[PDB]
Design a protein around this ligand. Structure first.
Ligand SMILES: [Zn+2]
Length: 18
DNA sequence: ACGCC
């Protein structure tokens, strides 16, 4: 499943960084 | 930013 803050694989929106 | 993993 994919991060949606960035759109990369693995990690969460909430913990993203962009 | 939110949700899930
Ligand atoms: Zn991300």
């Amino acid at each position: 499943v994919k991060c949606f803050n960035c759109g990369k694989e693995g990690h969460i929106a909430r913990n993203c960084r962009a």
